[PDB]
């Protein structure tokens with residue numbers, strides 16, 4: 362139900378406990394962490410992160426192609442954690 | 454993250470306070486003259502202003518007033534047609550309505566208000582429609598899914614909807630390649646619904662579609678037990694139970710409440726065979742969108 366997501370931002374490194382059905386950005390928001398976001402709808406680059414380890418369910422987002430998904434790109438507004446995850450944020 | 458459809462689904466474009474006024478295009482009894490109770494299939498026009506999706510309901514608000522002078526409360530009816538509709542132009546919605554007539558403890562014959570209004574519609578008549586309503590019976594995202602459809606009486610409706618889209622229609626973004634397995638339980642043969650259409654579907658996708666009828670008053674097994682939906686199911690007992698262990702199996706159940714219990718009891722003894730408590734497994738299947746119930 363709940364996973365540890367470590368968020369590596371350009372200001373260091375935070376730890377969040379994200380429920381398996383709350384979007385990462387949303388938890389981030391709840392715990393006071395300011396992540397960039399724009400559409401909030403999984404069809405632009407604005408909240409782009411990168412999964413360094415672990416796995417996300419990105420629930421049929423629209424922006425990232427298979428290639429990119431394979432490279433570990435995440436849309437942090439449209440991603441659920443499926444495990445303990447380390448994400449690099451702020452990544453346009 | 455839903456495992457059911459969400460993109461392109463809308464709800465409540467219309468509410469009881471200001472319904473959409475459509476037109477009855479046709480209204481046809483689909484049960485035989487000797488059935489216990491009439492079921493009617495009927496199609497309304499929607500000018501495309503109600504873009505529903507397979508699984509959803511619409512409400513009907515029947516003409517006139519109740520015994521206290523208030524307008525009648527919405528009654529919901531599962532949509533019997535696919536999103537593109539019986540005419541295939543996206544401007545119609547179809548229902549599958551059972552006419553409710555019953556004798557009460559006092560000896561009086563009572564007519565169910567909305568069911569008799571619906572079943573009485575002539576072509577040309579105005580119908581007050583609301584919706585779409587509901588997210589619960591939406592189809593799985595997965596086009597290669599195992600969809601197990603458990604229906605009694607008019608609970609065939611959303612499944613008539615699913616199966617039209619799966620097997621009678623070409624869509625660029627959806628090519629069904631899983632197994633569709635329909636169980637439909639009625640009390641008599643003359644109560645059967647859409648048999649011919651399902652016949653056609655079995656013919657053109659023998660590998661992708663199965664249909665099993667359970668006619669409680671005309672069929673037994675050799676143990677002498679009447680063929681309710683659960684007793685037909687019992688015959689594929691282990692096959693179904695295997696299928697349930699899978700990521701890509703979604704069970705949908707629609708119709709009369711009280712169909713529910715007979716099915717649970719089949720599952721209960723399947724579960725105990727494995728050390729498993731059925732209800733734990735069930736609520737857990739619900740959390741994965743895999744056991745979807747709309748009974749009434």
Ligand SMILES: Cc1cc2nc3c(=O)[nH]c(=O)nc-3n(C[C@H](O)[C@H](O)[C@H](O)COP(=O)(O)OP(=O)(O)OC[C@H]3O[C@@H](n4cnc5c(N)ncnc54)[C@H](O)[C@@H]3O)c2cc1C
Nearest residue numbers: 528529530531549550551553555565566567568607610749
């Ligand atoms: C989500 C959903 C989907 C539905 N889909 C369908 C569908 O596809 N097709 C369909 O036909 N119906 C469907 N229904 C049922 C439908 O909404 C109506 O409840 C039904 O048609 C009866 O409505 P009515 O106005 O004719 O009866 P009413 O005038 O509302 O009278 C019903 C009342 O009479 C009593 N009563 C009801 N049934 C009986 C009975 N069998 N014997 C004795 N007393 C009784 C009860 O007190 C009940 O509250 C659905 C309901 C729901 C909630």
Ligand code: FES
Nearest residue numbers: 399401403405438
């Ligand atoms: S903000 Fe545009 S996709 Fe997350």
